[PDB]
Design a binder for this molecule. Sequence first.
Ligand code: K
Ligand code: K
Ligand code: K
Ligand code: K
Ligand code: K
Ligand code: K
Ligand code: K
Ligand code: K
Ligand code: K
Ligand code: K
Ligand code: K
Ligand code: K
Ligand code: K
Ligand code: K
Ligand code: K
Ligand code: K
Ligand code: K
Ligand code: K
Ligand code: K
Ligand code: K
Ligand code: K
Ligand code: K
Ligand code: K
Ligand code: K
Ligand code: K
Ligand code: K
Ligand code: K
Ligand code: K
Ligand code: K
Ligand code: K
Ligand code: K
Ligand code: K
Ligand code: K
Ligand code: K
Ligand code: K
Ligand code: K
Ligand code: K
Ligand code: K
Ligand code: K
Ligand code: K
Ligand code: K
Ligand code: K
Ligand code: K
Ligand code: K
Ligand code: K
Ligand code: K
Ligand code: K
Ligand code: K
Ligand code: K
Ligand code: K
Ligand code: K
Ligand code: K
Ligand code: K
Ligand code: K
Ligand code: K
Ligand code: K
Ligand code: K
Ligand code: K
Ligand code: K
Ligand code: K
Ligand code: K
Ligand code: K
Ligand code: K
Ligand code: K
Ligand code: K
Ligand code: K
Ligand code: K
Ligand code: K
Ligand code: K
Ligand code: K
Ligand code: K
Ligand code: K
Ligand code: K
Ligand code: K
Ligand code: K
Ligand code: K
Ligand code: K
Ligand code: K
Ligand code: K
Ligand code: MG
Ligand code: MG
Ligand code: MG
Ligand code: MG
Ligand code: MG
Ligand code: MG
Ligand code: MG
Lengths: 166, 109, 163, 181, 258
Amino acid sequence: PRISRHRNSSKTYSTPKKPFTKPRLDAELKLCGEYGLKCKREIYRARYMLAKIRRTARNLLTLDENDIKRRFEGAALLRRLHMLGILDEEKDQLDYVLGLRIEDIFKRRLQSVIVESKLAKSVHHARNMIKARHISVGGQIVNIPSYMVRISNTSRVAIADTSSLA
Amino acid sequence: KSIRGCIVGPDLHALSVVLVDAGLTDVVVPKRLVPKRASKIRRLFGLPTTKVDPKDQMLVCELILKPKVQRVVTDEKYARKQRVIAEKKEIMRKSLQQLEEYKALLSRM
Amino acid sequence: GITHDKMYKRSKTGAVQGKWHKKRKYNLGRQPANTKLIQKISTIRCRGGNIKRRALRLSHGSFAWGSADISHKARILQVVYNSTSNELVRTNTLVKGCVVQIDSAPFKSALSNDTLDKEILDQIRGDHILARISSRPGQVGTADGYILEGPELLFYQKKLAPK
Amino acid sequence: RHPLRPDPDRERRALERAENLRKAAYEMAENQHERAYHKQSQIFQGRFLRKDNARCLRFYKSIGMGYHTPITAINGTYIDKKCPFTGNVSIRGRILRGVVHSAKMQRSIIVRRDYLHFVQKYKRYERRHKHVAAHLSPCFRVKEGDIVTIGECRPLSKTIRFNVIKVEPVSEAAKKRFSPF
Amino acid sequence: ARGVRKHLKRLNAPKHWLLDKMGGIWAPRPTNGPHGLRECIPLILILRNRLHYANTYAETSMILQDKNVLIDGKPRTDPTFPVGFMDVFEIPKVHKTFRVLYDVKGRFTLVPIQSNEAGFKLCRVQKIFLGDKGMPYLSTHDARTIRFPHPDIKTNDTIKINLKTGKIDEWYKFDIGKIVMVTGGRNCGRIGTIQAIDKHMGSYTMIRMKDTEGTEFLTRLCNVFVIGNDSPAVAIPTTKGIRPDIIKNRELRLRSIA
RNA sequence: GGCUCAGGACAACGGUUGCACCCCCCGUGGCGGUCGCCGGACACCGCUGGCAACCCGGCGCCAAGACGUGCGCGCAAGGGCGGGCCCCGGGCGAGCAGCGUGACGCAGCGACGGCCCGCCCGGGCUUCCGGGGCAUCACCCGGUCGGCGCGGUCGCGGCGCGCCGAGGGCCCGACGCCUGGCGGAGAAUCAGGGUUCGACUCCGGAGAGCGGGCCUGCGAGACGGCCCGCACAUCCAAGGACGGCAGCAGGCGCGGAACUUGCCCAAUGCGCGGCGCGCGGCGGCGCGACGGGGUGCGCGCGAGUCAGGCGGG
RNA sequence: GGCGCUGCUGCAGUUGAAACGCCCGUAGUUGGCCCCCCGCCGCCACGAGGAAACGGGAGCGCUCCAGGCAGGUUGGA
Ligand SMILES: [K+]
Ligand SMILES: [K+]
Ligand SMILES: [K+]
Ligand SMILES: [K+]
Ligand SMILES: [K+]
Ligand SMILES: [K+]
Ligand SMILES: [K+]
Ligand SMILES: [K+]
Ligand SMILES: [K+]
Ligand SMILES: [K+]
Ligand SMILES: [K+]
Ligand SMILES: [K+]
Ligand SMILES: [K+]
Ligand SMILES: [K+]
Ligand SMILES: [K+]
Ligand SMILES: [K+]
Ligand SMILES: [K+]
Ligand SMILES: [K+]
Ligand SMILES: [K+]
Ligand SMILES: [K+]
Ligand SMILES: [K+]
Ligand SMILES: [K+]
Ligand SMILES: [K+]
Ligand SMILES: [K+]
Ligand SMILES: [K+]
Ligand SMILES: [K+]
Ligand SMILES: [K+]
Ligand SMILES: [K+]
Ligand SMILES: [K+]
Ligand SMILES: [K+]
Ligand SMILES: [K+]
Ligand SMILES: [K+]
Ligand SMILES: [K+]
Ligand SMILES: [K+]
Ligand SMILES: [K+]
Ligand SMILES: [K+]
Ligand SMILES: [K+]
Ligand SMILES: [K+]
Ligand SMILES: [K+]
Ligand SMILES: [K+]
Ligand SMILES: [K+]
Ligand SMILES: [K+]
Ligand SMILES: [K+]
Ligand SMILES: [K+]
Ligand SMILES: [K+]
Ligand SMILES: [K+]
Ligand SMILES: [K+]
Ligand SMILES: [K+]
Ligand SMILES: [K+]
Ligand SMILES: [K+]
Ligand SMILES: [K+]
Ligand SMILES: [K+]
Ligand SMILES: [K+]
Ligand SMILES: [K+]
Ligand SMILES: [K+]
Ligand SMILES: [K+]
Ligand SMILES: [K+]
Ligand SMILES: [K+]
Ligand SMILES: [K+]
Ligand SMILES: [K+]
Ligand SMILES: [K+]
Ligand SMILES: [K+]
Ligand SMILES: [K+]
Ligand SMILES: [K+]
Ligand SMILES: [K+]
Ligand SMILES: [K+]
Ligand SMILES: [K+]
Ligand SMILES: [K+]
Ligand SMILES: [K+]
Ligand SMILES: [K+]
Ligand SMILES: [K+]
Ligand SMILES: [K+]
Ligand SMILES: [K+]
Ligand SMILES: [K+]
Ligand SMILES: [K+]
Ligand SMILES: [K+]
Ligand SMILES: [K+]
Ligand SMILES: [K+]
Ligand SMILES: [K+]
Ligand SMILES: [Mg+2]
Ligand SMILES: [Mg+2]
Ligand SMILES: [Mg+2]
Ligand SMILES: [Mg+2]
Ligand SMILES: [Mg+2]
Ligand SMILES: [Mg+2]
Ligand SMILES: [Mg+2]
């Protein structure tokens, strides 16, 4: 067989069960307003990634406090959530992995980082400037709007010094 | 296959034939090539194969691929052979020595 | 060809079983030697090499008298008994286990030393001795054996009785 | 073997199974319905003419695995090439136990074994059984219900691969039960 | 099939060969000889994939043609040559002499040694038998044979071999209390002391060892190679056959980047 | 190595045993004792031919790491005797393997020294547990179930044949019929328990239009080997010869439904040895499906164009 | 999947569809209380032994990503 038959691939979003439901059909465009979202697949994707960390946490929390699998994956899960900035330092217990939301995932996009840093007038301006290739992340130039910035790479957001803007 | 033919009957278009008990016979077609075996060449020009000098590197051949005779014994061939021959006695010398070695082991055990 | 594959047999409940391949070479059978008494030994090339000697028309064999411990060579004279069928007796066909008469001339110098089995001595005074074939003629191209004694001798003599 | 043959004063006297075996062989020689003459391949048959007792008359061996030989096979007079103790076959592979289902063949019995199967959806069991044919030496004599231990051997027929090596008997008229073991 | 197998798909290759699932559809298939197909690692996969001496098959071949690779004191020219446990690996042009041992995850490591060390070979006595005319032979785990063996040498023990003269100088006895290293199982690469040899009629005998920090483990007797007598006769890697557990390993993987 | 899933439902297949019932090339390590340089002849090639084309005839001069014979310190297969008459190291759980000694035989290795033996991978068979639907299929089988003996086999075995017995399976579903039945590793769905599918990537099996038979070889019941029957097609001066795409591309037909009659062995592997390889790779067709980014923001970009790198046989 | 409209978990059987007209009875299924500290099954735990890929899962910014096993003393647990 050609060697390409052996590559893995996978879907990254889940579509809600009841589509035509007014109350959250409204709070769903509210999110497309408070950030610059092309369509609903980027809310679906955020729900998809929150669901998995929730499922892992419930699996671990069924278990017992002195157990090895807790001692392994709880520490791993908290470390990766803290370094992505989905969870902050003061909450170092697994039971806090349950009370997150989509919004704290959205907070660490570049479009949010540069608006905290005030590098763009707004979020829609931030989007257009992202694709114009004008903002770099620590000396390397990042074309991605959905880019997820570790709080280590979060001090080094700025204009890309090769740009019409220095 | 259809190997057909006849006992030399009618439907025989073409045929092969050989003259025995001899316009007629007058021509000769030489022996195109020459012999190439150590024994051969000597028996040919009336020479034995039992006296220690089988070299016979005379080159006539009427200068006409096609020489390099075969089975011609030499010093190199002779010596190499001797080498193997002797070896096929040293093997057993040390082997039958080791037999005694192990016999003595057991006997002292 | 001839085969000894089990797939053509039924199960242990009597049901016809199905057919899921074509005959394999490694389950071949051959026809048997049917070694006639009285000199050919064919060669058969078996799986992986392995010369098998396959006899036809044997005349002699090496025969051993055990209790006296004397061996001589001798000419098989006649096949007289066989446990399977009278047909292999009637055809003088050399198979393992059959009982034959052998020439007495080789064993006639044992007729001197006494204190021996008289049931062997008086039979040596005649012109044959009763013996059994111990070899497989169709697999190894040879028919050797031993002379009978014990209860077994009496058993075969009674089978040979003039009834 | 560090210890060696304590002393009775009767052992050569009890050595008379030699004459027992000799006469059994001669009666088998006088039997004439039998097509062929049956004898062990391990024994000369010239040993039945001497009188000095010097050499053996019957062959036996131990099969190991912590199973002792029976005196019935040691002191019997039957010719069986498929016996594990006095024959020409060996025990290796699995050793199992069961009850004698039927005993209607010549030197051959059926052993029924019982077992369970777990069906996970239903969280419960079903009781199951299989049949196992086996060879029975004449040194043993069994009826239906007796527990038997059978050990593996090479093929011996279209259906037999096991051989009887121990019979734990059970009384008649007992309540038939599952008795899995 | 209708005959032997020549080819070998990459996925079907042994897991401990550490091949990568991309980079081909085929794998090198080891050739018959001094070791098997499962407990080995070929010469090419050592040179080309580990040490980068060659970046390709087409130039590993020529390294083996001009005879640059000494295995067990004798050269080799076959890329698929199976090198295994305790084999000696010396290339002179780069001044490197090794012996093959197992790591503590069941993989093949090349330990550096010295010229006073590459003079002997440890073999496991697989079996004792009789050949022509009634003579004794010992056949081992590296497919060496020795005739007229000293009767004290019995099955499952270990011998010490000279690579040149091919003869036995020392032997070690498999008893209760010998320093020993495993070769298969899920404790492959671990070293301990024989402290139980439990036997079973008809079936395999089981062996129970312990490291020098108290951790104990079990295996079959087919997987217990003897290396010394309360002291190893050959060198062993600085982990010495003690396995960490998953969290200790994770902190080390954290440290190496920290 | 590649292709395909037609056949086959106590099969195959999956795990789990065994061969004290077996066979094996290459490679590794051993071992090597065997009752004076020989002989003629074959292909390539020369001279003459037949035939529509397919394919061959006759005569002749020429080699071996080709045969044939064989120089040599006796040892291939098989066979008789050599065991203990509470029971329990050469090697075992297990009387297994060697050896000795009476008879046969003359095999293999020797004209450039290899018969032979352990290991290895592979095969064959083999124990146990799992292994589709129908009761408008209730009884089924008769080499069928066991015993003795020979034969055949690499080998065990009703595998085959002779003789003896009457067994063997079954509502814990036999037997029979049906399947638009390849098995597993797996995939789809989604609280938990479950339902359904297992064409195709790995492993195992089976086939090469359909019945069969076989030669050569360590290894095949081989179809890019041969021989015959059947069903189909092909050239032909009418006498004859000849085929097997369920290999890659491409054509027809069928169907709702599926791409180029490309370039390369440079990698990956295999063979032999520097090459060969439609394995395998690299481009082409390709909204089956997957992943990412735009059609603006408040004033700078990508989509295209033209040049140079980088990469790429 | 919705479906607890196939129900082991977990449906229904007076009147909506549905308790055989009754008694006996083999296979099957089920069977009170009692002795503890032995043996043989079942069961529970922990091991040994055998395949990857897939499925999880530790570490790693193909610019992110579907990925891949990378990489800067290493590693693919
Ligand atoms: K056949
Ligand atoms: K076939
Ligand atoms: K075959
Ligand atoms: K007997
Ligand atoms: K069971
Ligand atoms: K059970
Ligand atoms: K059971
Ligand atoms: K069970
Ligand atoms: K039940
Ligand atoms: K039978
Ligand atoms: K049978
Ligand atoms: K029951
Ligand atoms: K196949
Ligand atoms: K084969
Ligand atoms: K082969
Ligand atoms: K592969
Ligand atoms: K692959
Ligand atoms: K290879
Ligand atoms: K190449
Ligand atoms: K195809
Ligand atoms: K199929
Ligand atoms: K079909
Ligand atoms: K081969
Ligand atoms: K090969
Ligand atoms: K089986
Ligand atoms: K079975
Ligand atoms: K089976
Ligand atoms: K089964
Ligand atoms: K039914
Ligand atoms: K019959
Ligand atoms: K039979
Ligand atoms: K018959
Ligand atoms: K009958
Ligand atoms: K049924
Ligand atoms: K079909
Ligand atoms: K269900
Ligand atoms: K579920
Ligand atoms: K489930
Ligand atoms: K459901
Ligand atoms: K459900
Ligand atoms: K497909
Ligand atoms: K396939
Ligand atoms: K497949
Ligand atoms: K495959
Ligand atoms: K396969
Ligand atoms: K296959
Ligand atoms: K296949
Ligand atoms: K096949
Ligand atoms: K077919
Ligand atoms: K065909
Ligand atoms: K066919
Ligand atoms: K055919
Ligand atoms: K055939
Ligand atoms: K055929
Ligand atoms: K097809
Ligand atoms: K087809
Ligand atoms: K193509
Ligand atoms: K059409
Ligand atoms: K159409
Ligand atoms: K290539
Ligand atoms: K191609
Ligand atoms: K622009
Ligand atoms: K541009
Ligand atoms: K439902
Ligand atoms: K449900
Ligand atoms: K109810
Ligand atoms: K009503
Ligand atoms: K009704
Ligand atoms: K009722
Ligand atoms: K009813
Ligand atoms: K009733
Ligand atoms: K009742
Ligand atoms: K009742
Ligand atoms: K019951
Ligand atoms: K019930
Ligand atoms: K019950
Ligand atoms: K009850
Ligand atoms: K249990
Ligand atoms: K594998
Ligand atoms: Mg079960
Ligand atoms: Mg592949
Ligand atoms: Mg399937
Ligand atoms: Mg082919
Ligand atoms: Mg074609
Ligand atoms: Mg259509
Ligand atoms: Mg439901």
